[PDB]
Design a protein around this ligand. Sequence first.
Ligand SMILES: [K+]
Ligand SMILES: [K+]
Ligand SMILES: [K+]
Ligand SMILES: [Mg+2]
Ligand SMILES: [Mg+2]
Ligand SMILES: [Mg+2]
Ligand SMILES: [Mg+2]
Ligand SMILES: [Mg+2]
Ligand SMILES: [Mg+2]
Ligand SMILES: [Mg+2]
Ligand SMILES: [Mg+2]
Ligand SMILES: [Mg+2]
Ligand SMILES: [Mg+2]
Ligand SMILES: [Mg+2]
Ligand SMILES: [Mg+2]
Ligand SMILES: [Mg+2]
Ligand SMILES: [Mg+2]
Ligand SMILES: [Mg+2]
Ligand SMILES: [Mg+2]
Ligand SMILES: [Mg+2]
Ligand SMILES: [Mg+2]
Ligand SMILES: [Mg+2]
Ligand SMILES: [Mg+2]
Ligand SMILES: [Mg+2]
Ligand SMILES: [Mg+2]
Ligand SMILES: [Mg+2]
Ligand SMILES: [Mg+2]
Ligand SMILES: [Mg+2]
Ligand SMILES: [Mg+2]
Ligand SMILES: [Mg+2]
Ligand SMILES: [Mg+2]
Ligand SMILES: [Mg+2]
Ligand SMILES: [Mg+2]
Ligand SMILES: [Mg+2]
Ligand SMILES: [Mg+2]
Ligand SMILES: [Mg+2]
Ligand SMILES: [Mg+2]
Ligand code: NA
Ligand code: NA
Ligand code: NA
Lengths: 64, 180, 349
Amino acid sequence: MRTIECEFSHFAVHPGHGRRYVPFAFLSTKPVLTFSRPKCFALYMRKKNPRFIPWTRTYRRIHR
Amino acid sequence: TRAGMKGKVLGKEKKAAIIDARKKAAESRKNRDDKRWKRVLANMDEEKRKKFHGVGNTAKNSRVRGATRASLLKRTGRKPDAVSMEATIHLSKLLKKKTFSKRAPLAIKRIKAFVGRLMKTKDNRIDASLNTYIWHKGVKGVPGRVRVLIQRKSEHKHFYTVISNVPVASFKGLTTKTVE
Amino acid sequence: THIVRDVDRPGSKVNKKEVVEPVTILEAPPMVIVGIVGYRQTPVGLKTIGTVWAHHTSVEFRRRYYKNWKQSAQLAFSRQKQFANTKEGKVAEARTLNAFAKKASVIRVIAHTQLRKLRNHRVGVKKAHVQEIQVNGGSVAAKIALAKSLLEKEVRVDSVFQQSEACDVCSVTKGHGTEGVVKRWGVACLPRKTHRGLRKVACIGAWHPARVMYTVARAGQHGYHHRTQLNKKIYQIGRSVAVEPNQATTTYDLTAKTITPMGGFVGYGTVRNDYVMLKGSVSGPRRRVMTLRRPMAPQTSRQLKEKIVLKFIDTSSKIGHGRFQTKKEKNQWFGPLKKDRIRREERLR
RNA sequence: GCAAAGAUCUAACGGAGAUAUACUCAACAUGCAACGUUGGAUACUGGAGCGGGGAAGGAUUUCGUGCCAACGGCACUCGUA
RNA sequence: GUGGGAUUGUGAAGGGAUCUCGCAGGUAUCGUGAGGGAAGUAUGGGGUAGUACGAGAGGAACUCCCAUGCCGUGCCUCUAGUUUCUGGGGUUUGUCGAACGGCAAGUGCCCCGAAGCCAUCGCACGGUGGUUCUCGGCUGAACGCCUCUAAGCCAGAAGCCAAUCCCAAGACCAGAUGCCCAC
RNA sequence: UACGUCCCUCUCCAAACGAGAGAACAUGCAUGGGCUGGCAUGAGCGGCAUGCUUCCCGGUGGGGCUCGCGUCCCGAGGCGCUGAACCUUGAGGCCUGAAACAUGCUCAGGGACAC
RNA sequence: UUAAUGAGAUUCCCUCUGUCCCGAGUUACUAUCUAGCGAAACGACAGUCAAGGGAACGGACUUGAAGGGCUAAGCGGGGA
RNA sequence: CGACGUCGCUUUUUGAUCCUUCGAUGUCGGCUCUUCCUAACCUAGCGCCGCAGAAGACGCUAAGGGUUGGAUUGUUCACCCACUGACAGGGAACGUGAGCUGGGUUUAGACCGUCGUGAGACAGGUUGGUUUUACCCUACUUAGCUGGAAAUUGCGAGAAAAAGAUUAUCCGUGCAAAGCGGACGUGGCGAGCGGUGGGUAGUACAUGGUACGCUCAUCACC
Ligand SMILES: [K+]
Ligand SMILES: [K+]
Ligand SMILES: [K+]
Ligand SMILES: [Mg+2]
Ligand SMILES: [Mg+2]
Ligand SMILES: [Mg+2]
Ligand SMILES: [Mg+2]
Ligand SMILES: [Mg+2]
Ligand SMILES: [Mg+2]
Ligand SMILES: [Mg+2]
Ligand SMILES: [Mg+2]
Ligand SMILES: [Mg+2]
Ligand SMILES: [Mg+2]
Ligand SMILES: [Mg+2]
Ligand SMILES: [Mg+2]
Ligand SMILES: [Mg+2]
Ligand SMILES: [Mg+2]
Ligand SMILES: [Mg+2]
Ligand SMILES: [Mg+2]
Ligand SMILES: [Mg+2]
Ligand SMILES: [Mg+2]
Ligand SMILES: [Mg+2]
Ligand SMILES: [Mg+2]
Ligand SMILES: [Mg+2]
Ligand SMILES: [Mg+2]
Ligand SMILES: [Mg+2]
Ligand SMILES: [Mg+2]
Ligand SMILES: [Mg+2]
Ligand SMILES: [Mg+2]
Ligand SMILES: [Mg+2]
Ligand SMILES: [Mg+2]
Ligand SMILES: [Mg+2]
Ligand SMILES: [Mg+2]
Ligand SMILES: [Mg+2]
Ligand SMILES: [Mg+2]
Ligand SMILES: [Mg+2]
Ligand SMILES: [Mg+2]
Ligand code: NA
Ligand code: NA
Ligand code: NA
């Protein structure tokens, strides 16, 4: 199977890892979100922006 | 030990004979294997040679295949009566999930057992500088690591040690040393 | 670890679809054959006729006869070798083999493990494990011929088992010491209001019979029992890493990797010899020795006859939530770090 | 069984209470455990106090020197003995 | 015979007699298996098939595949739970002159958290032959004919017994074997 | 007499205590290094540069106080050195034997049975 | 009949939860091992079962079936 | 199916009796847990119907395996709502209180109705009302040490063993055959087969550790 990227941190998710979540106000283009760690989901539910967390790919690309 | 190996039964001279008898048998089988592998590896073609890896005692950082470690360890002799060492003790791995109200008293016992084991001494005295360092954050806040100075003295003859604290900024890169 | 594979099962909802299955890894260094034994049938069972020893045995095998090998005289099998080399020893061996050929109906070989080959740091034992392996098929003469040919020689696991077969696993379960009835038998807990504790069995018998029966649950030892574990499917038989470094590389995943995960197996180390990848779980903890046996139940179901082709083998770290398959992948993600920069500067200077 | 009231550690003095050995022997593997005082360290009470004084009740329990048979449900070289 | 001890209670030294005990096994592996225990059990879907049967209404089942419930024995790759690794960080009151380092609040409190343990909250596995009962038959008399019965035979139930699985020589194994000693 | 066994010692697949699996100068133990992972960017210093990053680039703050549009100070927070600092086997993770870890400690083991 | 009041008796709803489905993990003090110290209750004699008869529910009696000796931690069927 | 009659079984109902227990055998129900019976609800086989099919009825062997979640009530019993292949009936001191619980019944406080002049009464209603002890023997669950066949002694001898100068006076094969094939020599000294230890070559095995060819030296058997 193909490897997916985490919704929050863009970590690589290999087959047999992580959890998938379906929000009620789902988006038609992608209805299912993938998370690699429980830490990533907790930050997502707090509505934190990944661009401010220094260990995410979004932060690294801006400051490089 | 068994009756056939007791020092007080065989005697000093008879005991030494057995040790060399085993040593030469081990060495004779050793040197025969070194010569055999040297001939075969040299006679071997390169296609077979690269496949055998470090069987010829050729690979780097790969020990001596012929014998065991501590058989190549050169034994200088009996250490003097008065010696001094500096060593680091990893205290946090000895005190894990112990009761909080007993950590500082337990660290004292572990240090005395640690020093007495490698010094062959039953009388170990804790200097006031080391006792203060262990206790200086309460019963629960024992530091993870400690650097100590061990001195063995003699007054049968009686032996004892005095253990004191060595203040350091960082523990990184420090190994056991013998000081004067 | 776990693997991914495609399913060939007509009529199922997962036909021609990918599934994820957990597997267990067993290291299998070659064994050594040192003995031959024959049995005869009597109205009271099987009786041993005799045993034929090999001319040379190893220190590993001979260590099994001592409690303190390094301080002993080490005299095991010396007189046996001295006698068996002579003329009378040849006569005795011939007589024993003739007795096997004439009066035996079961032939077994005495074999032992190789702990020097298994260069493991956490398995502390150095005296070899010994067992008997029965020889099936053919006539008694053919069995004896095969046993004689396999004497003082190594045997590999692939010569006993094939890839897409099944086996039984004899082993001993993990131990837990003394346990109560709730965890030992699975009885229910009592209400919160119970005086004198609630993790118990309320009634242990009626008035008559006036004694406790053997069918009532009691506290005691739990774990460390022997089990047989039928029908475990073999998913892979892999060669030594010193011979074939690409152990976990498949046709679909071309990444060069071995079977050992990043950081090594927790509490075990590195797999250095041949190995067997079985589907599912087996009884016992890591580092314990177990026995694989050829199946005794019928092998006719579609599940037991299906051929297995692997597509992906997981090699991420088992410490924490591993998210890298290879150290090259981790380096690609992170890039140069402070330690690497310091090392490069020191090397340049 | 001797489990409420958080807790002791260290060195030096004192003491019969020790570093107490038949052979072998360098020391460990053959004298353990425990005590009072002083100096350090670490804690607790937390002013409705294991603070400083009185009534009722007790009547020498107060103080110094000595001593350790019995008593202080473990111990004592200490004690309201 | 040999080697050790010992005799009844009122002082010592020598002898004698008598009595009791020891005089061959020890240590380490691989196996046998009498006897005892004993376990797997149910439902649905596909197809048969809108078929057989039936004026019509209506309406089955076996070989063979695919799943599930209960029970049993394990396991920790994944997911979930648990933290006195007081691991890392944050934060309140007091406190060491301040920063640093911390400390007290019987684990101050909050977030994340490895290893281990663990969930029908996760994953794996759960076999084969005989002997019969009820009953259906074959060959057959008694009894002229007849008749599964009187002699004989066949097929035969989730029953019973054995195999597989667990403990296993007070079941005293003259089962095999390594080494030392005695003869 | 001899082979040997147990205790003291060390390890943990075992474990209430017994019992078990092992080792007997052994990468055995200790400390360090690297890996794998956890948390989330240490103390200190500094603001057009003896600071940081390449081989040319970047360089705050709502307000307030002095002295002469300037120049020095107070200020929660922010930026740089900095995916930094710290922790990582202990009731007990990995590497000294595929390719790409190092040092130190042992210097006649002690005792009892076998008898 | 009654506003206010009640550690009074009763029924329902919201919130909440290990009361339960269905249990799992951790901590202090115990139990457990050691040093010192050290009791009580109770105690005819004792202590493996099946059936029988018997003061109509036996440890002892009749006929059968088991049973080598000594010990550590638990347990609550019997000792009417 | 079966009237009028008639014969039996059971001790899971209530009566009848008063044999045991009053210097005491803890007493209703529920919870938990095990085992037994069959008069068979489901599951396995058969037979027969007034059995076209489907759905059913009435029997026989058979107790191996199953037999549920809730509202009201202290309940047992009962009734209703749902699920299911089915929601069968009973025993074990009316199984089970040093296993729990204490709602009911059944002390002392208090209210009502009826009865009584009254103190008081009521298998009438109501509210509140201490649940003690195991460290002994056995049973059961795990966990250690250890003798012993004349079951501790007698010297009291029995092999699921081999076959011969009475198991001695060789070994192998063969049918407990007919036969066949082998065996170190002359007191020391020679020969052969082997265990170790050196000197040397190559090969095998998973490749540091073992085997094998030649040669030399020792130690054993013959
Ligand atoms: K900083
Ligand atoms: K940073
Ligand atoms: K009655
Ligand atoms: Mg364990
Ligand atoms: Mg209560
Ligand atoms: Mg893990
Ligand atoms: Mg006690
Ligand atoms: Mg206590
Ligand atoms: Mg108490
Ligand atoms: Mg206390
Ligand atoms: Mg002392
Ligand atoms: Mg002091
Ligand atoms: Mg006061
Ligand atoms: Mg006292
Ligand atoms: Mg049986
Ligand atoms: Mg099933
Ligand atoms: Mg988790
Ligand atoms: Mg976890
Ligand atoms: Mg804090
Ligand atoms: Mg503060
Ligand atoms: Mg604190
Ligand atoms: Mg009876
Ligand atoms: Mg009997
Ligand atoms: Mg007991
Ligand atoms: Mg009882
Ligand atoms: Mg009475
Ligand atoms: Mg009575
Ligand atoms: Mg009673
Ligand atoms: Mg009573
Ligand atoms: Mg009754
Ligand atoms: Mg009670
Ligand atoms: Mg009772
Ligand atoms: Mg009540
Ligand atoms: Mg009146
Ligand atoms: Mg009441
Ligand atoms: Mg005898
Ligand atoms: Mg005899
Ligand atoms: Na105050
Ligand atoms: Na006929
Ligand atoms: Na009695």
